[PDB]
Design a protein around this ligand. Sequence first.
Ligand code: NA
Ligand code: NA
Lengths: 279, 278
Amino acid sequence: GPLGSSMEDHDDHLRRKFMEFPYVSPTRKQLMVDLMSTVENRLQSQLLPCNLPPDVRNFNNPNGSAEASLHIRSGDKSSPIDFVIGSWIHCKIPTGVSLNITSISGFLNSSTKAPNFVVELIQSSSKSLVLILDLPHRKDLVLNPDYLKEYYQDTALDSHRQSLLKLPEVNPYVSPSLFVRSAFSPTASMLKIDAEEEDKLEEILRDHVSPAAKEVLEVWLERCVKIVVGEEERMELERRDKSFRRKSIEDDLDLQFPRMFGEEVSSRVVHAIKEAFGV
Amino acid sequence: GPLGSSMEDHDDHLRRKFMEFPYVSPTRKQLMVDLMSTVENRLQSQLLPCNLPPDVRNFNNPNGSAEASLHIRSGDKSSPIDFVIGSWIHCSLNITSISGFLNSSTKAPNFVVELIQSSSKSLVLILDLPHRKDLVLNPDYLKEYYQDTALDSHRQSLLKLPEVNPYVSPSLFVRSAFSPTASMLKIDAEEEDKLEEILRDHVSPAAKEVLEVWLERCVKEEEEKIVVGEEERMELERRDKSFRRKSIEDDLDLQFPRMFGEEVSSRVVHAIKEAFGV
Ligand code: NA
Ligand code: NA
């Protein structure tokens, strides 16, 4: 290009579609762009290139009802990072209620025991947007009062949830899944945001959700990603990490995907994603 | 007396002093009485007599502003039960509660019900079977004790009520230590009559049903079922100790002098920690 090499360099271009975030608002794709850019800019020296086949990075329902994009960058041999994953999912089928999901998860390996990172924006309905924003814990918080103190007390993580909840439009979200409730830290922002007034929703996303998410990511990068872990704790951590991932993707990959993308697309991608997700 | 020993036995005497629940609503006293008596009546054969000093079991600010009473029964040698602890604190401030704490011979959930009144226009209920194993690392623990038991239905039901809102603790320790199905609820006392209604007709059956799941599904031994080995017991003992310690330590170190005085406090808080095994 005149101003650069995005449309020339293959790596940059493989994520161009991912970063397009076609099916969401300006404010929503802007948050996600900024978040994914920080992740990759900040961790570029320890992240392997995306090796997902083009076939798995972008896929769709041939009937045009559903479209997804996935961007995964594994950590290098010496990284505390296992992998980071950006995703978006679009499904507009039934009477016309279009499901939209944008998310970024960061997952640490055994060599550290520090918290993971998660943001998810999910709009299935039209009266509601769900925000999941957390640094989920990788150690039992009652057995380890010190872990709780340095990752959740010292870090003022709960200020972000208390802040967002003050808004009249923002109620607590309660997962029907007990695993979800257990897997997320006591400072997790699990929130429902009223969605039926685009101009106000947009204002809440840009003035409130965005600073909050950027600051949470800021502590993940600064206090979690930036003593050794012994072999007994390593196996504990790996058993725990594998449950959390499996359980987090299983029903979606196995039940939701064949519906959304037809069977042919599911059969092509589902295994490859479980592969990529270590499960 | 002609049909009993309660006016004649010392331990039976100052166990009734507890059961009086003097500073609380008539329906609150009944809940506590039914619950505390259900625990001791179903677990009679496993529970040791209250082995605890008399001036520990009951006390008061000598200036008469505070009043507290504690009933504590240790499990016997072969019991899964560590101790059970019913209590009331008046000082306004009305706390009634019944905690069940299991030991390391079993990994099964504990039991807690607290009713904390620290402002009118509200009542805090905490009703849980607190987990004793990490729920993500032990999904089968999550299943047996929370999913299979339908414990969440109590939380969901109560919360339908327009007077009943969720309660989010200031402590991140209590958020982590209570199960995903825990009823952490704020009930708004618009007026005593509506509050009473909720207590009698909603809280009471929920607490009883949760207790029933405890007794029958948590403390009741399974058939040829296994022993807690090597020392997952070491894990269990460390988790329990910290849980019990954070359950009382700031109350015992700051609220107790603040409330009862200084020497009554001094005479009482050590015996507590000891009784609580922290
Ligand atoms: Na609100
Ligand atoms: Na309610």
